[PDB]
Design an enzyme around this catalytic site. Structure first.
Site, PDB file in Angstrom:
ATOM      1  N   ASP A  39      42.011  43.002  39.870  1.00 45.98           N
ATOM      2  CA  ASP A  39      40.938  42.264  39.217  1.00 45.98           C
ATOM      3  C   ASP A  39      39.694  42.200  40.098  1.00 45.98           C
ATOM      4  O   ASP A  39      39.752  41.730  41.234  1.00 45.98           O
ATOM      5  CB  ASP A  39      41.401  40.850  38.858  1.00 45.98           C
ATOM      6  CG  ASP A  39      40.243  39.908  38.590  1.00 45.98           C
ATOM      7  OD1 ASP A  39      39.845  39.174  39.518  1.00 45.98           O
ATOM      8  OD2 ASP A  39      39.732  39.903  37.450  1.00 45.98           O
TER       9      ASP A  39
ATOM     10  N   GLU B  27      39.774  46.899  37.767  1.00 47.50           N
ATOM     11  CA  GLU B  27      38.461  46.447  37.322  1.00 47.50           C
ATOM     12  C   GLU B  27      37.355  47.002  38.213  1.00 47.50           C
ATOM     13  O   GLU B  27      37.102  46.486  39.300  1.00 47.50           O
ATOM     14  CB  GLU B  27      38.400  44.918  37.300  1.00 47.50           C
ATOM     15  CG  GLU B  27      37.735  44.341  36.061  1.00 47.50           C
ATOM     16  CD  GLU B  27      37.944  42.845  35.932  1.00 47.50           C
ATOM     17  OE1 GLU B  27      37.672  42.297  34.842  1.00 47.50           O
ATOM     18  OE2 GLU B  27      38.382  42.216  36.918  1.00 47.50           O
TER      19      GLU B  27
END
Ligand SMILES: *[C@@H]1O[C@H](CO)[C@@H](O[C@H]2O[C@H](C)[C@@H](N[C@H]3CC(CO)[C@@H](O)[C@H](O)[C@H]3O)[C@H](O)[C@H]2O)[C@H](O)[C@H]1O
Ligand SMILES: *[C@@H]1O[C@H](CO)[C@@H](O[C@H]2O[C@H](C)[C@@H](N[C@H]3CC(CO)[C@@H](O)[C@H](O)[C@H]3O)[C@H](O)[C@H]2O)[C@H](O)[C@H]1O
Ligand SMILES: OC[C@H]1O[C@H](O)[C@H](O)[C@@H](O)[C@@H]1O
Ligand SMILES: OC[C@H]1O[C@H](O)[C@H](O)[C@@H](O)[C@@H]1O
Ligand SMILES: OC[C@H]1O[C@H](O)[C@H](O)[C@@H](O)[C@@H]1O
Ligand SMILES: OC[C@H]1O[C@H](O)[C@H](O)[C@@H](O)[C@@H]1O
Lengths: 715, 143, 143, 143, 144
Positions: free
Chosen positions: B75, B111
């Site tokens: 992330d 990400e």
């Protein structure tokens, strides 16, 4: 008249790098890194014919920057090599020459060595635009072939030594040349003389077990090449500090040779050693290659992908940044090179069962572009690694480039070669008078050097001699270096050898001389084996090995460097001395310490864990401590030590009194309180019956150049 | 891996801030009493420190060999490449991660950006790395 | 009904290697076959020319040639699939489209009503009415 | 020098699925392709008919469509090869065959002599002379 | 005059054995190589005599490498059931070379064993198959 696709094949795998016998799919998997190559060709050879490819497969698959193929039917033993195509532009660093047959940098075995010949250079030799030119002679027939191998080896008795082995703190290192070890050992049948197998034989194993050393540090055993300029002089690379591949053990040490048997021959040797409770540390060259600069040959890395692998002049990219002093320096900043080096390390650990590495020219590994950085990528990756975090790491704390003196600067887990220790200690006995500090510190594991970085006396690898420089014999047998047999008009080798002849040069008959040498030899030996830190013995100095004042015998593959096992009275009677000294060091914790001595009373005792006296009878003061001297004298309080074992017990020894006298003349020292039996000395003469004890703060005369250790048996 | 629940300053003192604050967290180089925030969650782990990098890599190896996870989707993966002030995709962490025997075989999704300045790093990620395709998400939505 | 539909659709993805590709479609023929592995079309048969590749569009149509893909499994076998014809009309209004030459079969669409029997099989450059917001996949049973 | 020939021939057989088949060739177009998985021609340039098929000959010539094969591996993938053109001439005299559409690199033969530089490709349905007692295999590299 | 039957110890360690057992050569990619154990390697001075024209000879590096090169996948050995030389062939200074005259169905012909003849024919055989499998090679025997 067929195609590259009328031959049964598979796409293969990017990993691992190199060639892998995949038993299950009955074939081999060929992985090769190159982010600049435009095309790659697998070259398969056969036993008999090695001038031409048996077959040419084109590696057509490429995951990222890794070409991979899988050829069915290939098993272990299969010879192969690499062609790499790509842009040739020596101005820009691009040096692709697909005529030049290359070695798989991930080979675990390499067949022969190089048959020197202009055609291995990928520029025109005699041409005026050297190394700017593009030579297109095929070189297959001269370059050794890579061998696919079967990695299966049964480490019988292996696994158990794995396990509370030799801690750095009780270790005693023995630097040996695989060949030189045992070439002149008719005790073994020839043909294992000067090989691995020879090294790990009963005869030898028993020797080492006797001698009392715990770990052996082998000189470079990465497959290496003989520099041409050494060949063109009827000479050889004897030391081996010119690696061409990082995964394959040198073929010229294998008894079985040469085809797969070098790695098989190696593993047995380590197996054999471990069975005997002996660690193995290999000298490791990672800082430079044998491809040298430009003008040098094109064998392996230069061909595959020159931009990586090699540090280039950022403004030119035609020439090579050289902090190693050998023509090129490995680009330890490129991810693939960092991986290769690390793989190599893990490979040699888990596969070959090495126990540690002595890195040559360490600092060269912490180079970015022009600057040193003990916090570069490579070192941090090495530090976090689960496998490597467990092995012994030792360093030559310097390279030759500017600002490459890195003593004391290596991350924890590193022991570094103490060159302060060697130089000082050598100049102390020589006769020089250094400040009481500069020697007491040395004697105590160089706290000044290493305590500023949270390291312990472990990290200090103490040594008087080494493959670099004189031997212990020639350290007391010479003032200047006699390296005329190297064929460099005696223009190589350290000039300052901080040595002394004992009043001559070379061999002698003058008994007064020999006696001096034999004394000093024992002064050195008493020192090293009584100083805090980790002591290293140079392989042979227990034989009084001589290189005839050659202090740089790197190319001397002969009797100059051969171990001589023929021992007369003198030579052997010393062997006995090194044995007993070593045993002394080992039997006494007050010298194998994990913590430094502070200068105070501990645990509420009335004594200091240590104490430095003067020549009569007197604790050192701020001024005498800074002022020079040739007479050091100090007491270690076995009982008032802050040494705890792994079970949380503190660790008494006995109380000693070391008296070191480098003064050329005699002196009279006043013994501190209590009563002081004699144990060890430099005296080659019958120990006077009035020297074997000292009582009541009284005093005794001591011939110059003499070391004495005493044990307090009553206070 | 990019940030902690200890926020910026004014945040709580639970774990890292308390064990070593100069080690674990990217501090404003001019102040070092304020936290560089590339995540938007108060603070940013600095994967330039040898021990910080070791912990993240230790962790990854732990969930693999110990929890038998098959891969991770990172992330705000970009904030992991911040080393100094900017996104160097050639950082120490990524490099060690690439060369690792264990993590070499697992999946690594990303990400490919953070809330930082110039953080948008779509497509710049190392190989074996896969990317959440934000452009797909949007393009197809709009179509 | 949607659950079911997603199932049927995931089952389709994983049935046909033409979508689980390891390499990219090139814009050209391959392996000395007439048909080219991938083609895009316009409302009418004429293949997507240049300015038509740049100009905006609410309608996408393309034909994957399953039998001429550069796809090789770990065993050195080229893979093949079926040949499919995708119709993606994002336009809100209806549209007429001209199928390329072959004889085509309706495999799946986003139509919630029962599919008219004359959409189940198109043939011979024929034409078809496509309601707005409608996606269709087609298989060429004959050519 | 023959040993070398058997070696290369065997490798050819092995490298090509269109010869190691678990299913027979039918004589039709499969999977909605515009070609036959196989096709038997005459001496010029002509698919065999009921009569020529029953009548004798010393010259066999046939095309295997790698791509339009019904060969599935154990993982349920269909299995392209390349398209070949085998020309077998047992006729004692020479003959002139007309190559079918497309372009046809040479691969293997009986010729012990330097392969004529005008035999190493054939284009555009044109033709070529063939010494009696001679076998030739061809690979279509463009159609 | 009649040879004697030998009791045997059937124990043999099929090292690397078990794994080839397993997605081997399907009939569909197979390429068969019909060989006579003896004739194979009798005139192969490449090996030391006395394994020339035996099992052991067949499964040697030299040979295994040959077959691996050649590119065949499976080898079909001619009859290796212990067989007899017809008298009418003997009375002509001749021999049964092919072997298509078995007398027992469980014993491998002794005249191919390097170790001979007493228990060593079956030991010599097993090694040969072991050696072949290690090389990814099937074995098909002619059976009468
Ligand atoms: C640490 O690493 C050093 C460099 O690899 C080792 O160097 C020793 O061996 C080298 C081959 C030698 N090279 C130079 C020799 C000379 C003249 O003497 C030149 O002609 C060459 O071009 C140089 O490359 C070094 O001088 C020698 O010290 C060292 O032993 C290792 O411990
Ligand atoms: C990727 O990583 C993101 C940050 O770790 C994830 O963020 C999501 O959860 C966060 C806790 C939330 N934080 C902010 C919330 C608000 C106001 O909405 C502030 O008051 C806080 O101080 C902020 O920290 C994020 O907004 C939210 O998107 C994301 O889901 C991951 O995929
Ligand atoms: O530059 C090379 C030199 O570096 C350091 O001074 C070392 O102490 C010395 O031994 C070495 O020769
Ligand atoms: O540059 C090399 C020198 O660096 C430091 O001054 C060391 O103290 C000295 O011993 C060494 O020779
Ligand atoms: O900075 C974070 C943001 O970067 C980009 O704008 C992404 O499209 C968005 O989804 C993401 O939240
Ligand atoms: O706000 C979202 C946008 O942020 C930046 O401009 C990115 O470069 C762009 O790709 C992204 O869509």
């Amino acid at each position: 008249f067929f195609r590259t696709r009328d031959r049964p094949l598979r796409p293969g795998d990017p990993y691992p790098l190199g060639s892998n016998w995949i038993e299950d799919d009955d074939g081999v998997n060929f992985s090769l890194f190159s982010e600049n190559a435009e095309k790659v060709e697998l070259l398969l050879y056969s036993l008999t014919n090695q001038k031409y490819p048996k077959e040419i497969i084109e590696v057509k698959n490429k995951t990222g920057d890794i070409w991979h193929v899988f050829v069915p039917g290939l098993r272990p033993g299969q010879l192969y090599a690499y062609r790499v195509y790509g842009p040739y532009k020596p101005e820009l660093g691009l040096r692709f020459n697909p005529n030049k047959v290359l070695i798989d940098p991930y080979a675990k075995a390499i067949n022969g060595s190089v048959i020197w010949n202009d055609a291995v250079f990928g520029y025109k030799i005699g041409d005026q635009n050297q190394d700017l030119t593009y030579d297109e002679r095929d070189s297959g027939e001269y370059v050794p072939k890579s061998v696919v191998i079967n990695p299966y080896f049964e480490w019988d008795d292996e696994d158990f030594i794995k396990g509370k082995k030799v801690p750095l703190k009780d270790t005693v290192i023995y630097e040996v040349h695989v060949k030189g070890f045992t070439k002149l050992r008719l005790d073994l049948p020839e043909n294992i003389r000067g090989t691995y197998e020879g090294l790990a034989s009963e005869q030898m194993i028993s020797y080492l077990k006797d001698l009392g050393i715990t770990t052996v540090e082998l000189m470079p055993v990465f497959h290496f090449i003989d520099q041409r300029f050494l060949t063109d002089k009827g000479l050889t690379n004897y030391w081996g500090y010119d690696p061409i591949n990082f995964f394959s053990p040198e073929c010229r040490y294998s008894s079985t040779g040469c085809l797969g048997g070098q790695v098989l021959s190696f593993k047995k040797m380590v197996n054999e050693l471990h069975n005997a409770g002996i660690e193995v540390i290999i000298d490791v060259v990672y800082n430079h290659t044998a491809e040298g600069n430009h003008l040098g040959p094109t064998l392996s890395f230069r061909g595959i992908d020159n931009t990586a692998y090699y540090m280039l002049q950022p403004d030119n990219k035609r020439y090579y940044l050289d902090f190693t002093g050998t023509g090129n320096t490995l680009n330890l900043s490129h991810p693939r090179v960092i991986q290769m080096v690390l793989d190599s390390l893990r490979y040699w650990v888990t596969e070959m069962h090495v126990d540690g590495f002595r890195f040559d020219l360490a600092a060269a590994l912490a180079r970015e572009l022009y600057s040193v950085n003990m916090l570069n990528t490579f070192f941090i990756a090495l530090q976090q690694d689960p496998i490597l975090s467990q092995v012994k790491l030792i360093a030559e704390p310097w390279d030759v480039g500017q600002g490459g003196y890195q003593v004391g600067n290596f991350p924890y887990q590193w022991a570094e070669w103490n060159g302060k220790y060697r130089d000082s200690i050598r100049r102390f006995w020589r006769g020089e008078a250094l400040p009481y500090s500069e020697i007491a510190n040395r004697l105590l594991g160089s706290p000044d050097i290493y305590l500023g970085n949270n390291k312990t006396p472990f990290a200090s690898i103490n040594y008087v001699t080494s493959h670099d420089g004189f031997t212990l014999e020639d350290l007391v047998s010479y003032n200047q270096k006699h390296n005329e047999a190297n064929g460099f008009n005696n223009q190589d080798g350290m000039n300052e050898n901080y040595s002394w002849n004992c009043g001559a040069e070379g061999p002698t008959n003058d008994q007064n001389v020999v006696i001096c040498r034999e004394k000093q030899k024992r002064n050195f030996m008493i020192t090293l084996l009584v100083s805090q830190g980790t002591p290293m013995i140079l392989g042979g100095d227990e034989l009084s090995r001589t290189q005839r004042g050659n202090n740089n015998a790197f190319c001397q593959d002969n009797e100059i460097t051969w171990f001589d096992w023929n021992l007369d009275e003198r030579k052997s009677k010393f062997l006995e001395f090194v044995k007993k000294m070593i045993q002394f060091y080992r039997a006494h914790p007050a010298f194998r310490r994990e913590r430094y001595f502070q200068g105070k009373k501990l645990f509420g005792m009335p004594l200091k864990d240590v104490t430095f006296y003067t020549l009569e009878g007197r604790e050192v003061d701020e001024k005498t401590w800074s002022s020079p001297t040739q007479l050091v004298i100090f007491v270690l309080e076995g009982s008032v030590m802050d040494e705890i074992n792994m079970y949380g017990e503190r660790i008494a020894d006995d109380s000693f009194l070391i008296i070191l006298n480098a003064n050329p003349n005699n002196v009279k020292v006043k013994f501190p309180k209590g009563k002081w039996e004699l144990v060890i000395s430099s005296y080659l003469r019958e120990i006077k019956p009035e020297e074997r004890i000292i009582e009541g703060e009284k005093e005794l005369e001591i011939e110059g150049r003499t070391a004495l250790v005493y044990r307090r048996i009553e206070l």
